[PDB]
């Protein structure tokens, strides 16, 4: 591979696949545009006003929010799938393996990219037109109060790495090509691709983050934290399954089935 050409190809594809980039999100979050400010959502009244001002649905806040997260997740799975197809070699893999890689990869990827939309105090919503506070999300009734908080905890640590979109494009590709997913039929060709992606990621980080020479190592070690969030999320979903008499979008059910 030409590792610089690969990195560029992945960045261009990431830009085509994901309409809200970390670059745009950071501009919005630091107020460095290009306004006006996003509408801030911190209580039920401001959530309701936000729906007016402006854009089955529960009239209960916790479920309304949970439903919004589902809809956005369904969109994210489609974007991620488009992106996966652009990774060299991916569409030549066994189709059962392609499905396996997406099934087990999407949570890791979603939560990695969600950090781009977060600062310590809240998260951009609705394509950046709104900003939903972390404390508001924490205040939701049980069991939903703990729905977002682990994502924020991860995000604060992960955002400390100061990755940009060009870094993230390669890291997300590395996540997709994970040869250790349960059920993979041909592990070798997945690892051959991941090996090239890791090389590209390493060079990219070395060149563009000269002050932190071991950022690559630091980034690879975030997988435990990321997988921990996913585990806590699946556990919460089980509690929600028992407690809520709740409907899950078919694509999400499909992902969770035998996960």
């Amino acid at each position: 591979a030409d590792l610089r050409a690969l990195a560029k190809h992945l960045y261009d594809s990431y830009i085509k696949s994901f309409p809200l980039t970390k670059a745009k999100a950071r501009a919005i979050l630091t107020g460095k545009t290009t306004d006006k400010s996003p509408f801030v959502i911190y209580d039920m009244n401001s959530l309701m006003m936000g729906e007016d001002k402006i854009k089955e649905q529960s009239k209960e806040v916790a479920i309304r929010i949970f439903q919004g997260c589902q809809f956005r997740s369904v969109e994210a799975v489609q974007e991620i799938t488009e992106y996966a197809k652009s990774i060299p070699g991916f569409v030549n893999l066994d189709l059962n393996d392609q499905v396996t890689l997406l099934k087990y990869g999407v949570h890791e990827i979603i939560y990695t990219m969600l950090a781009s939309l977060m600062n310590k105090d809240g998260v951009l919503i609705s394509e950046g037109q709104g900003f939903m506070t972390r404390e508001f999300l924490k205040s939701l009734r049980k069991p939903f109060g703990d729905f977002m908080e682990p994502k924020f905890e991860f995000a604060v640590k992960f955002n400390a790495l100061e990755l940009d979109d060009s870094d993230l494009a390669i890291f997300i590709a590395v996540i997709i090509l994970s040869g250790d997913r349960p059920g993979l039929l041909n592990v070798k060709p997945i690892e051959d691709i991941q090996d090239n992606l890791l090389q590209a990621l390493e060079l990219q980080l070395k060149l563009n983050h000269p002050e932190s020479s071991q950022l690559f190592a630091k980034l690879l070690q975030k997988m435990t934290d990321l997988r921990q969030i996913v585990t806590e999320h699946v556990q919460l979903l089980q509690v929600i399954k028992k407690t809520e008499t709740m409907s899950l979008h078919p694509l999400l059910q499909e992902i969770y089935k035998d996960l």
């Binding site: 799975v77 489609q78 799938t81 197809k85 189709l95 392609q98 499905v99 997406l102 099934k103 078919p250 694509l251 499909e254 992902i255 089935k257 035998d258």
Partner: peptide
């Protein structure tokens, strides 16, 4: 087979 929607997205 067990993942109808994901399969369609992929092809």
């Amino acid at each position: 087979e067990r993942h109808k929607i994901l399969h369609r997205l992929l092809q």
